[PDB]
Amino acid sequence: RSDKELKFLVVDDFSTMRRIVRNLLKELGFNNVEEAEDGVDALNKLQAGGYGFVISDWNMPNMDGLELLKTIRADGAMSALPVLMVTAEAKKENIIAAAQAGASGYVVKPFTAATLEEKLNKIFEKLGM
């Protein structure tokens, strides 16, 4: 469901990929998107409050996507923030891994506005937001 006003934290290590996700969210109606690069940087940012969703890249320096997912899932107050794992390559192994660690959903790169929206809708339904 198109809530339009939800704060998204796009945690993407690659500048080009990071911009693409933001542009997509904007196009979908979600005009509240902030950006981070890696797991650590994301945690700090998310800790300030306001954010109601995390969009993280699997292949991230220092603290990767899957590790970042765990840090959110266990960080008391942050434990309820939905996670969309942006995977470089999607295979059964990492898909199951993502779900097991708290990931609300996952989107493989490159993904479009429609692909992103489909995932968003699904996440919202599960959460009952």
Q: Give the torsion sign (CA, 17, 23, 25, 31).
A: positive
φ, ψ of residue 47 to 5 degrees: the values are -60, -25
Q: Which amino acid is at 3?
A: D
Of the candidates 93, 24, 17, 3, the residue with the CA atom closest to the CA atom of residue 56: 17
- In contact, 72 and 81? CB cutoff 8 Å: yes
Rounded CA gap, 94 and 6, in Å? 27
Of the candidates 120, 74, 67, the residue with the CA atom closest to the CA atom of residue 94: 67
φ, ψ of residue 106 to 5 degrees: the values are -145, 140
Q: Which domain holds residue 33?
A: 1-129
Length of the chain: 129
Rounded CA gap, 91 and 81, in Å? 24
Asked how this structure was determined, the answer is NMR
Q: Which amino acid is at 60?
A: M
Which residue has 């990929």 as its token pair?
17
Q: CATH number of the domain that 70 lies in?
A: 3.40.50.2300
Residue 42 CB contacts under 8 Å (≥ 6 apart), including other chains: 9, 11, 36, 54, 56, 63, 68
- In contact, 33 and 6? CB cutoff 8 Å: no
Determine the Cα angle at 125 with ends 38 and 116, to 5°. 45
Rounded CA gap, 36 and 34, in Å? 7
Q: Which amino acid is at 126?
A: K
Residue list for the binding site for Mg(2+):
12-13, 57, 59
DSSP letter at 78? G
Distance of CA 109 to the CA centre of its chain: 13
How many domains does the structure of the chain reveal?
Answer: 1
Q: Which amino acid is at 115?
A: T
Residue list for the binding site:
12-13, 57, 59
Rounded CA gap, 37 and 86, in Å? 13
Rounded CA gap, 98 and 107, in Å? 11
